[PDB]
């Protein structure tokens, strides 16, 4: 499974706080990336591995 | 010939429906609408760039 | 001649309108405005001073 999000709010919450984010919201969700290649993420400067 | 190209299949769902006892696992996400009649429509994924 | 300059062109939008599923990624910033009828009309930037 790759990085998905059913809203941008959950992907902002994932970009901000990596460890304590919300993987499931009320009417949305977000699936983290468990790929064998660690694709480093960047939305501005909020660096998430 | 040692510069081989792996192929990894990636998947993600789009527009599921959550179970009816809806919940949140983190605060500070306030979407200004009805949270019970909330429905996914999209899949905001991340590109290579 | 080894003290050359660069031209890093910058940009920033002014006065965009957010979609009607409005949201927040952080609490503890409470404005005394109508949050659904909110509308940017300025754009505060930083200087180099």
Curated annotation (Swiss-Prot), chain A:
Domain of life from the UniProt record = Viruses
Where, per UniProt, does this protein localize? Virion; Host nucleus
Q: How does it assemble?
A: Homomultimer. Makes the hexons and eleven out of twelve pentons. Interacts with triplex proteins 1/TRX1 and 2/TRX2; adjacent capsomers are linked together in groups of three by triplexes, heterotrimeric complexes composed of one molecule of TRX1 and two molecules of TRX2. Interacts with scaffold protein; this interaction allows efficient MCP transport to the host nucleus. Interacts with capsid vertex component 2/CVC2. Interacts with the small capsomere-interacting protein/SCP.
Q: What family is it from?
A: Belongs to the herpesviridae major capsid protein family.
Role played: Self-assembles to form an icosahedral capsid with a T=16 symmetry, about 200 nm in diameter, and consisting of 150 hexons and 12 pentons (total of 162 capsomers). Hexons form the edges and faces of the capsid and are each composed of six MCP molecules. In contrast, one penton is found at each of the 12 vertices. Eleven of the pentons are MCP pentamers, while the last vertex is occupied by the portal complex.
The name under which this protein is listed is Major capsid protein
Q: Which species does the entry assign this protein to? A: Epstein-Barr virus (strain B95-8) (HHV-4)
Q: Which residues of the full protein are shown?
A: 1333 to 1381 of 1381
């Amino acid at each position: 499974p790759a990085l998905s999000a059913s809203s941008r709010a959950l992907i902002d919450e994932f970009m901000s706080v990596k460890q304590t984010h919300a993987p499931i919201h009320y009417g949305h969700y977000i699936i983290e990336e468990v790929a064998p290649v660690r694709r480093i993420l960047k939305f501005g400067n909020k660096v998430v591995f | 010939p040692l510069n081989r190209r792996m192929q990894y299949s990636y998947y993600f769902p789009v527009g599921l429906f959550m179970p009816n006892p809806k919940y949140t696992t983190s605060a500070a996400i306030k979407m200004l609408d009805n949270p019970t009649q909330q429905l996914p429509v999209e899949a905001w994924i991340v590109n290579k760039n």
